[PDB]
Design a protein around this ligand. Structure first.
Ligand code: CTP
Ligand code: MG
Ligand code: MG
Length: 431
């Protein structure tokens, strides 16, 4: 059964004649442009090992340079070989297109093996060398892994996904031999599982760690979040229990009507709202970590102010960002208890009592307390206040945007914004 499912899964993960066509054209051409210049380079991507997922074609070329320091020559070479170009940020590289195919031209040292100068980009060539000879023949196993992860939103080590990188997928296929064996054993991974590829061993450690065979101190699964690891383990246990081709297919967007959402929310009886603001002009890897931090600070504020947040989420559209929240408390009393000093402190007590208040302070369990008034009674009002004077804690660029402008939105108005998918997921809505 399973083998039959994996067989049909291949038709979803293995590229196609018309994209294996573009990659074969752009490659020859790129070599021609690189050779004429007499450049030293090496293709090192998923493309270079035919392990790239269907529809995800892209080429990675690393230019090799000695022991000198400013490879602004790369800026030069790339621009001179790529039909179109862009500078993506020791991180600046050329990204463009050649014969229609996306290409990355990156600056590294033709290092006579492991040492890596201010390593990062310099490791990429060894990663390729280490894999090239071990992955041969299992290309499609890698593809099944990638396709499986992707269909479930966990392929990609970028901050927006915090999932499994392509490289991590190839080390795993190499360690276990195949996609199936990988999932079968991933059913027993724990948050303390250490997969040491170079030593062919699995042990227990401090956190989930997949030792890079090229550099033992590096955790290849550094960006995989604890929760996406958990989801993969659970997915594996589910697939083996009942394999289905559906695990290799994107789930379909819960086409939900605003009136059905209003009904779910009034039925849950919670306060559902979002903070809307202009999306700052920064790259995803910079934006997402700020959206996560801004969402956590606001959640912590809601917890502290006793609005009992249930869950939060965020969304980045083309022009705006949204921080979504759901709280168990829609309204809290205007009066609250303010803690005073122990009865023994004559001086501080006199001070605590000198303040004018609508009600009389009192002693309880040896300490003075006073009833005082809150400056807001709903989580929406609480957040309007917080976002107005504590935007500095919400990330450098996200906070600056909120400082210029933001609005708290709820109800139908909220349902009209492009955040319905996030809302449904946040509340666990099902079809
Ligand atoms: N040690 C490294 C460092 C970087 N890359 C590059 O980092 C990006 C991740 O790619 P890879 O790990 O090869 O997998 P994907 O490119 O995601 O492959 P696919 O989209 O086809 O699934 C790629 O452009 C790849 O060229 C790599 O392969 N190995
Ligand atoms: Mg690639
Ligand atoms: Mg790339």
């Amino acid at each position: 059964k399973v083998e039959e499912i994996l067989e049909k899964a291949l038709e979803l993960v293995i590229p196609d004649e018309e994209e294996v066509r573009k990659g074969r054209e752009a490659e020859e051409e790129l070599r021609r442009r690189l050779d004429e210049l007499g450049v030293e380079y090496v293709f090192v991507g998923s493309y270079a090992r035919n392990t790239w997922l269907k529809g995800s074609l892209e080429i990675d070329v690393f230019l090799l340079f000695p022991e000198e320091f400013s490879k602004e020559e790369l800026r030069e070479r790339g621009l001179e070989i790529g039909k179109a170009v862009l500078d993506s940020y020791e991180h600046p590289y050329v990204h463009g297109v050649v014969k229609g195919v996306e290409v990355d031209v990156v600056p590294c040292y033709k290092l006579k093996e492991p040492k890596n100068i201010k390593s990062a980009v310099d490791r990429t060539p060894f990663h390729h060398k280490w894999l090239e000879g071990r992955i041969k023949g299992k290309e499609n196993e890698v593809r099944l892994l990638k396709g499986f992860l992707k269909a479930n939103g966990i392929y990609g080590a970028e901050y927006k996904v915090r999932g499994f990188s392509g490289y991590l997928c190839e080390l795993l296929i190499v360690f276990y031999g195949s996609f199936l064996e990988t999932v079968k054993n991933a059913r027993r991974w724990t948050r303390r599982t250490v997969i040491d590829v170079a030593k062919g061993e699995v042990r227990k450690g401090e956190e989930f760690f997949v030792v890079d065979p090229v550099d033992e101190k590096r955790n290849v699964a550094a960006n995989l979040s604890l929760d996406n690891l958990a989801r993969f383990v659970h997915l594996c246990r589910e697939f083996m229990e009942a394999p289905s081709l559906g695990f290799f297919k994107p789930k379909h967007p819960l086409e939900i009507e605003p009136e059905r959402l209003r009904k779910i929310v009034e039925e849950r009886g919670t306060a559902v709202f979002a903070v809307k603001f202009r999306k700052p002009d920064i790259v995803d890897d910079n934006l997402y970590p700020q959206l996560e931090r801004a969402s956590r600070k606001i959640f912590e504020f809601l917890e502290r102010e006793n609005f009992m947040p249930l869950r939060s989420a965020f969304k980045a559209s083309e022009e705006f960002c949204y921080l979504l929240f759901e709280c168990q408390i829609k309204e809290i009393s205007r009066v609250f208890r303010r803690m005073g000093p122990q009865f023994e402190d004559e001086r501080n007590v006199k001070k605590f009592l000198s303040r004018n208040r609508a009600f009389r302070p009192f002693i309880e369990n040896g300490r003075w307390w006073a009833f005082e008034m809150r400056k807001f009674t709903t989580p929406e009002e609480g957040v309007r206040s917080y976002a107005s004077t504590h935007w500095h804690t919400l990330g450098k660029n996200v906070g600056e945007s909120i400082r210029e402008y933001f609005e708290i939105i709820s109800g139908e108005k909220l349902f009209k914004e492009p955040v319905t998918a996030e809302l449904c997921e946040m509340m666990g809505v099902k079809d």
